[PDB]
Amino acid sequence: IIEPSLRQLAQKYNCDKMICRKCYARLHPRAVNCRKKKCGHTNNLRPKKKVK
């Protein structure tokens, strides 16, 4: 259907990401602070939910 290494490529671009608990912005997996000025670089971060 979709080959494994090809899949975990697009996963790298769509899935493994931290997300701001404040402003829902999408960040890379090493993030400890957010980007946005609107939330205030919160650090209330949480992984993107892995689809079941």
Partner 1 sequence: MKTILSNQTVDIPENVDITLKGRTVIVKGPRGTLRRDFNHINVELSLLGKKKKRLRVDKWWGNRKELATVRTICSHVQNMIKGVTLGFRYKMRSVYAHFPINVVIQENGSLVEIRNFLGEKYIRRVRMRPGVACSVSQAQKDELILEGNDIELVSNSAALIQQATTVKNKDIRKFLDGIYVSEKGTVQQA
Is beta strand 45-47 parallel, antiparallel or unpaired with respect to 26-27?
unpaired
Shortest reach from residue 48's CB to Zn ion, in Å: 14
2-28 in b/e form (b: 16+ CB < 10 A) is eeeeeeeeeeeeeeebbbbebeebebe
Q: What mask, x for binding Zn ion by CB under 5 A, covers residues 12 to 31? A: --------x-xx-x------
Among 17, 39, 45, 48, binds RNA (CB under 7 A): 39
- DSSP letter at 49? P
Q: Which does 9 bind (CB under 5 to 8 A by kind): RNA, partner 1, Zn ion, none?
A: partner 1
Binding site for RNA (CB under 7 A): 37-40, 50
